[PDB]
């Protein structure tokens, strides 16, 4: 049930912190990398951190954080790329995608685009 969003950019898993911060880690021992993908519409899912109790949301500036309340920015389009990876685009911002930097830090949505490596996620079972 719990899925770990493995990014093909550096090899980091999306880690949601209970404080609201989101980053990427390589260790599979971290219990904050266990996320649950709730579906709202066909192709639209919401990423919620199991051991965080917060939902992934993107701000109108490009920042990525975890909200405690479900907002319109907590919904992302679940798309399958031709490389067998999952691309997540915000429903509020159809021009911004979710991405993780090779440095382990999250990537600004305002700096995302098709063709990048940081935008390629793989939901691995936990």
């Amino acid at each position: 049930d719990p899925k770990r969003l493995y990014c093909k950019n550096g090899g980091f898993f999306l880690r949601i912190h209970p404080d609201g911060r989101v980053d990427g880690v390589r260790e599979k021992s971290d219990p904050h990398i266990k996320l649950q993908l709730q579906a709202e519409e066909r192709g639209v899912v919401s990423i919620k951190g199991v051991s965080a109790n917060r939902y992934l949301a993107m701000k109108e500036d490009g920042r990525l954080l975890a909200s405690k309340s479900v907002t319109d920015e907590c919904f992302f389009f679940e798309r399958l790329e031709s490389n067998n990876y999952n691309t997540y685009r915000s429903r509020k911002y159809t021009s911004w995608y979710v991405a993780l930097k090779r440095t382990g830090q999250y990537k600004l949505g305002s700096k995302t685009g098709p063709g990048q490596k940081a935008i390629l996620f793989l939901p691995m079972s936990a």
Partner: protein
């Protein structure tokens, strides 16, 4: 043989690319990336943000000086081949 011919090529390519550094027995990081972007670019069509580069430099520098060698050179080929392939399934 197969590996026999591969050796002749690998040995030549090694010296060829190591010549970019200044001599012809070691690589200075940049040459490693050059190898990936020129020889393995047909296989590994990713890189860009430097993902595999971060992992290979962690296993290549066995000496601890940033100096490449024939020993890690071939291991480098293995690393880039398996890492990108197994990137579809991590622990």
């Amino acid at each position: 043989s197969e590996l026999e011919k591969a050796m002749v090529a690998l040995i030549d390519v090694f010296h060829q690319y190591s010549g970019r550094e200044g001599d012809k027995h070691k690589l200075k990081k940049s040459e490693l990336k050059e190898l990936i972007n020129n020889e393995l670019s047909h296989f590994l069509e990713e890189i860009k943000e430097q993902e595999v580069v971060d992992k290979v430099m962690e296993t290549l520098d066995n000496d601890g000086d940033g100096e490449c060698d024939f020993q890690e050179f071939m291991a480098f080929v293995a690393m880039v081949t398996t890492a990108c392939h197994e990137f579809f399934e991590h622990e």
